[PDB]
Symmetry: C6
Subunit: 217 residues, 6 copies
């Protein structure tokens, strides 16, 4: 990655970072919590480091191929926004990055450093991570095993356990933060068992999740 000692300098990706990423993917596959873990392990990442982390995954090649497809789409839209002059470059001067330069396929580490450490920075690392996360979210959703519609409380299931499944499903199904805030007063109640549902109805509306979990405890 790029970090300050100080000044902004390139640092070797650590065995710890490399191992942490591979292990989280081995253990959790594309459970949605893997995404913010990817983001935090890739703190300060050059595009080279981002390729390194993705390339070190041995499984999930279906997913990695879908991710390439997402990255080419984003790359093509970059090149539509920021077309570069095809003429040869000014001696000693910074060339403008292309989609494939951001994706690290046609850029060197040195060019990647040049861009990221420029005043002001061309943040090719951050632009690329954005594309990658956009792609990883598609895969979380694809790999989401269960519709929120099939998350219903078992007659003998503690409410808290039911709500954990519900909001875990909502997260993988990529429901917006609004519909997460809103499903409380709608589908969470409708999908609750009769006993708890009766209690929840009687709370009336405006009931916090904390109050609902209290009520059906």
């Amino acid at each position: 990655p790029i970090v300050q000692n100080g000044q902004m300098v390139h640092q070797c990706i650590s065995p710890r970072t490399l191992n942490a990423w591979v292990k989280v993917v081995e253990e959790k596959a594309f459970s949605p919590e893997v995404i913010p873990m990817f983001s935090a392990l890739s703190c300060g990442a050059t595009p080279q480091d981002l390729n390194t982390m993705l390339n070190t995954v041995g499984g999930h090649q279906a997913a990695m191929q879908m991710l390439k497809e997402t990255i080419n789409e984003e790359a093509a839209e970059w090149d539509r926004l920021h077309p570069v002059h095809a003429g040869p470059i000014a001696p000693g001067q910074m060339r403008e990055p292309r989609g494939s330069d951001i994706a690290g396929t046609t850029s060197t580490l040195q060019e990647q450093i040049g861009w990221m450490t420029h005043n002001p920075p061309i943040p090719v690392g951050e632009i690329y991570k954005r594309w990658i996360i956009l792609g990883l979210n598609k895969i979380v959703r694809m790999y989401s095993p269960t519709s929120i519609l099939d998350i219903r409380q078992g007659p003998k299931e503690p409410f808290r356990d039911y709500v954990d499944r519900f909001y875990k499903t909502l997260r993988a199904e990529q429901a917006s933060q609004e519909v997460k805030n809103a499903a409380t007063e709608t589908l969470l109640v409708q999908n609750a068992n009769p006993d708890c549902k009766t209690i929840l109805k009687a709370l009336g509306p405006g009931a916090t999740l904390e109050e609902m979990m209290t009520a059906c405890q």
Copy 2:
């Protein structure tokens, strides 16, 4: 986080910190000791780092949704206290943070750095951690399985084991430090078994916990 090398500079959250947090949550869920562990692992945390740690939790989505609700409440009270001018910002100048800027949802890492490293600091990291801990304590209490009233010494249970359950329950039930200091001379004795209770009564009042544990050893 933000640390001194020196001067105050941003540092990538470490794989060790990320792994430690996820593991403590996997092993201990919302046992009350998880809170001061969260606090210490989040030493120097930007709001981004605080979101990162919370977002890396894969389970307990019921709890994480309750936490959002706590954070929106605190955020709304911040905005009631410190309303910001809605006009566009002075070129090159620090804008005032809003509730959602402190929660890291509408603020950039750079703005978060600007605030935290300002002279004097606007400690958005520390303000946010406060909100989060307030929220985590609600969840400790919610997840507390047992009323102090049902912590009674078994006829064959060593007093020390009984007292460990008692003060563990009191801690999860969020009893104040006063009522922790006071329950000694009241409920600890009443909830003790007949044999030990007889010994404890005969100590008279003002008996330290050390003296009571000695007495019923």
Copy 3:
């Protein structure tokens, strides 16, 4: 903790330190070797770091409550020795610490830093660790399962194994270094089995432990 880079600056307590402390307590409870381990893991600790380490212990709440009682006693004796002027403080100036300021309950991290890094230092970290260790030794002794009087050599037990139990018991029972130096020529021999006891008597007095262990090998 506080360390030199250099100059004296505050450093985040490490996940390694946090994990090491919790693990030693999980594995060893209040075996006496846990105390010097606590001392060494808490090298350079602010009172905040000392609270952090104690607060991260999930079990042993009986012990943690006894420790508070020890800390309040020490705190009250501090305040008897070093009463502070109750008037408001000189702008920009260091206030004098109270018992509860040393225990970290009424002091901020910044005040704790101010004191510890002052010329000369007010070593609130070291004063507090002293109180805590005083409290932990009471708990070692309380939790000591066995009187030295019941450490007797089995007829078939190697002398070395008997001496390991004896000096392990003496350590937990908090016997002074004198009585550790002295019990050799008295209780170690009396508690030895007949066979070895006969050999030990015949050594006459002034026999080193090394000579006694040699003699009964």
Copy 4:
């Protein structure tokens, strides 16, 4: 390796790096993901460090012998491109590296440092790693157990599982990124089971992998 503290200086290869490399080879042998792992663990590597990592592998001596053969070929082509003057060297001056100097067999660490830290650098580390990776890819391909032609979807096999095997096989068989982009619309469909194949045909052409995986879910 060589890193900046600062200035460019030699650093001992870490036990962590050494252990990480040996463990990845023990666990994964020559699965293609081992190559980018080798590349990232060898970040900043001198040729000495590259020999060290390869030499620490205890198994796979067939592969290590093939790798030497690749390295001698590359070395011979270097010497064809950059023949060196056989006359004795200018006192105190940098000699030109030969194929075997790049491979670290006839060069000292100091000469390797001289070259890599020269203005401008002679990047013998990077030139050698290139040769090594060229050699490792031959071995990935050799060790590839299965022709893409024998990756066919089982009648009861989830499409996603079939696609994971397909793109895992394509990767080990070293198929170009074009033929990875292209096999989607050809062999992936032909090798799909009848049920899914019928669905895929009906998508018509231009179907993304994401759409195909959706369609046969």
Copy 5:
């Protein structure tokens, strides 16, 4: 310990060092290889750090008591060599260390730092480690289970295995490097089985260990 950043400054003993020492003692007890491990883990150690490492051992209290006895003897001989003036000390000036100051029982960390960082250094750490190792060697020897005289090659035992037991026993029995160099041509042969003994005799004298192991392979 004391290290250079730079200049000579005090550093907290690391959790890694603390854990490494306790684990080596748990796994190996007083096998002779534990001594050079103790020496290397205690690199740069103040007497405080040396007490810390010894104090963190939970078992082997027989051994730890023998070690105190060794340390008091060495301490008493120090005080015989370097008696100190009993008069009060020159304000702001370095006092001379006593036996118990070197053993860390009557010295502060600051005094220990003063001595060790003085120009020239009073190396109380190194003087104390010497005493401790002297004491640990007595314990290795005491704890040595087997006389070299009972190391005899089994009729079916590979010579190499016999020699490993022989030189392992010699090491624990603290045989000098001379008698290690010499026992080759004497007791190693006499303690060898008849078959190998016949071969070894026929080598004649001056046979290296390498030649003897070759001969009886």
Copy 6:
């Protein structure tokens, strides 16, 4: 070891290095890959550090005694090459190292530092490591269980598995890189099974190992 912060300064050998060395010896004994691992773990090692690593090995005392014998031989040849003047040394001046000074038996750490950090360096660490590796290779060869002559392909054994055993045996038997390059066209074929041997003969000469492994796949 000795490293640059910067300037050349002494550093404590790390618990990680100490543990890594002991573990590699516990797991792999004297498999030839242990040697380059020893070399890399001993990067920057003083002779003291080299003694430390060898001394921390608890097993293999037969081997460690053979190693001493190798080191005395090398030491005696050093003293034949570089005899030192037996007169007392120039006050404040660097004495010349003897064989036993290089082996760390008669030299202090400070003298070892003086030599290694001198302008220009007297590289006693590197000279000693050379002696040690020379000695370790003798032991690899001694401990080599199997003649290359007994590495023959089983009728049902994959060629690749046969070649792995062959080149693993060649490595332990310390065959030169020439005879490793050459045995391909000779003994590898002769020791191959009839089926594969027939294929290999028909390749004619000049067949790379890659072509032979392809041919008999």
